[PDB]
Design an enzyme around this catalytic site. Structure first.
Site, PDB file in Angstrom:
ATOM      1  N   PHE A 287       0.843  -1.201   0.000  1.00 37.20           N
ATOM      2  CA  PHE A 287       0.000   0.000   0.000  1.00 37.20           C
ATOM      3  C   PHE A 287       0.878   1.250   0.000  1.00 37.20           C
ATOM      4  O   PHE A 287       1.915   1.208   0.675  1.00 37.20           O
ATOM      5  CB  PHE A 287      -0.853  -0.126   1.283  1.00 37.20           C
ATOM      6  CG  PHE A 287      -1.971   0.907   1.319  1.00 37.20           C
ATOM      7  CD1 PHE A 287      -3.216   0.612   0.770  1.00 37.20           C
ATOM      8  CD2 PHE A 287      -1.784   2.153   1.912  1.00 37.20           C
ATOM      9  CE1 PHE A 287      -4.259   1.535   0.829  1.00 37.20           C
ATOM     10  CE2 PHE A 287      -2.807   3.099   1.918  1.00 37.20           C
ATOM     11  CZ  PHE A 287      -4.040   2.786   1.378  1.00 37.20           C
TER      12      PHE A 287
ATOM     13  N   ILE B 171       3.242   5.023 -14.775  1.00 31.38           N
ATOM     14  CA  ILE B 171       2.727   3.905 -15.578  1.00 31.38           C
ATOM     15  C   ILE B 171       1.706   4.418 -16.604  1.00 31.38           C
ATOM     16  O   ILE B 171       1.052   5.461 -16.394  1.00 31.38           O
ATOM     17  CB  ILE B 171       2.174   2.797 -14.665  1.00 31.38           C
ATOM     18  CG1 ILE B 171       1.117   3.320 -13.756  1.00 31.38           C
ATOM     19  CG2 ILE B 171       3.329   2.026 -13.980  1.00 31.38           C
ATOM     20  CD1 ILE B 171       0.395   2.193 -12.997  1.00 31.38           C
TER      21      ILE B 171
ATOM     22  N   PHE C 258      -5.869   2.188  -7.750  1.00 35.82           N
ATOM     23  CA  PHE C 258      -5.612   3.468  -7.161  1.00 35.82           C
ATOM     24  C   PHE C 258      -6.870   4.278  -6.918  1.00 35.82           C
ATOM     25  O   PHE C 258      -7.828   4.202  -7.694  1.00 35.82           O
ATOM     26  CB  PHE C 258      -4.767   4.362  -8.081  1.00 35.82           C
ATOM     27  CG  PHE C 258      -3.347   3.885  -8.313  1.00 35.82           C
ATOM     28  CD1 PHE C 258      -3.081   2.971  -9.301  1.00 35.82           C
ATOM     29  CD2 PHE C 258      -2.271   4.383  -7.537  1.00 35.82           C
ATOM     30  CE1 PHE C 258      -1.774   2.552  -9.555  1.00 35.82           C
ATOM     31  CE2 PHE C 258      -0.972   3.972  -7.789  1.00 35.82           C
ATOM     32  CZ  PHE C 258      -0.711   3.084  -8.789  1.00 35.82           C
TER      33      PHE C 258
END
Ligand SMILES: COc1cc2cc(c1OC)OC[C@H](C)Cn1cc(nn1)CCCOC(=O)[C@@H]1CCCCN1C(=O)[C@H]2C1CCCCC1
Length: 128
Positions: free
Chosen positions: A55, A75, A118
Site C-alpha cells: 500500500f 505507468i 488506485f
C-alpha cells in the site's frame, strides 16, 4: 471492496477497449478542462496491489505527487487515466498488468503480472 466495484461498474477508458484501465468517478470535478500532454499535474493518491500486499499513499508524505502528463514518467494507466480527470475529481482506477508493470513486474516491490488499484484526486494542473 472498491476494486471489485470497479470491475463491476468501471468504464473502460482504453483506446483498444481491452478493459486494461477501468475507471469510476467517485467525486465529480469542476469545469470542462482535462489536462493535456505536457501539463504539470498535482495529485493525491493511494495505491495498492489488487490483493493488498503493498500500500502506498501520497498522504503519508503530507504533500501532493507531481508529474508531467503523457511523458511515461508514470505507468501508462496513469497517463491515460489522469488525462480523463477534471480539477477536483476523485476517481478509482483498476489496472491490468499490461498498463502497469507487465510480465516483468518491478521486483521486489511489484510482482510479475500484477493488477493495481488506485484512488486519485486531481488537485490541479498547469501548462508546460
Ligand atoms: C515501481 O516503483 C514504485 C511504484 C510505486 C511507488 C513507488 C515506487 O518506487 C519508486 O515509490 C513510493 C515512494 C514513497 C514515492 N514515489 C512514487 C514514485 N516515486 N516515488 C513514482 C514511481 C512510479 O509509480 C507509478 O508510476 C505509479 C503511479 C504514480 C504513483 C506511484 N505508482 C506506483 O506504481 C506505486 C506502487 C502502487 C502499488 C502499491 C506499491 C507502489
Amino acid at each position: 471492496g472498491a476494486p471489485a466495484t470497479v470491475t463491476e461498474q468501471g468504464e473502460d477508458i482504453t483506446s483498444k477497449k481491452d478493459r486494461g484501465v477501468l475507471k469510476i468517478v467517485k467525486r465529480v470535478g469542476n469545469g470542462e478542462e482535462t489536462p493535456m500532454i505536457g501539463d504539470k499535474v498535482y495529485v493525491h493518491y493511494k495505491g495498492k496491489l489488487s490483493n493488498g500486499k503493498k500500500f502506498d499513499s501520497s498522504h503519508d508524505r503530507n504533500e501532493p505527487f507531481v508529474f508531467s502528463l503523457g511523458k511515461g514518467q508514470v505507468i501508462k494507466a496513469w497517463d491515460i487515466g489522469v488525462a480523463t480527470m477534471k480539477k477536483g475529481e476523485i476517481a478509482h482506477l483498476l489496472i491490468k498488468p499490461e498498463y502497469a508493470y507487465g510480465s516483468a513486474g518491478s521486483l521486489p516491490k511489484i510482482p510479475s503480472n500484477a493488477t493495481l488499484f488506485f484512488e486519485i484526486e486531481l488537485l490541479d494542473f498547469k501548462g508546460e
